[PDB]
Amino acid sequence: ATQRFLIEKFSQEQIGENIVCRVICTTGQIPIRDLSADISQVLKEKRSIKKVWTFGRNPACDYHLGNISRLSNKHFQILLGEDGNLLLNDISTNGTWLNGQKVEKNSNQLLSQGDEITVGVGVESDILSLVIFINDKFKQCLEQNKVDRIR
């Protein structure tokens, strides 16, 4: 078999290529996206953050959401590094919220399991929520931090 094999992968997709965390919109506005980072880089990098995602209505931003006035070009930024765990950074004009708690802009916060970021606060009808899903696979490798396989 050859061509048929390619079809088999169509139904059975291999999830977890090198994903760090997943972003899911609970308010139903933006399509689910998956944040990823290279393990080799994370293992080699001892200082600073390995990789950070920028979210906003800008097509540049690592994450693209609905073009909302309450949101900024780069509404928020997510960073993964340090001795494990993940960090959430806000970069919006109108502010970024975490589970109803407004965090300090351009500030790093300790990620939470299935956490959620709210944005567009100020107008009851202009708030958007986002949920972050962290895969245990990434943490599993970080715990071992040992290389013994190709790709």
Partner: peptide, 10 residues
């Protein structure tokens, strides 16, 4: 072809 940032109207 232009952004738009604000902080609610009041």
């Amino acid at each position: 072809n232009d952004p738009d940032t604000l902080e609610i109207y009041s």
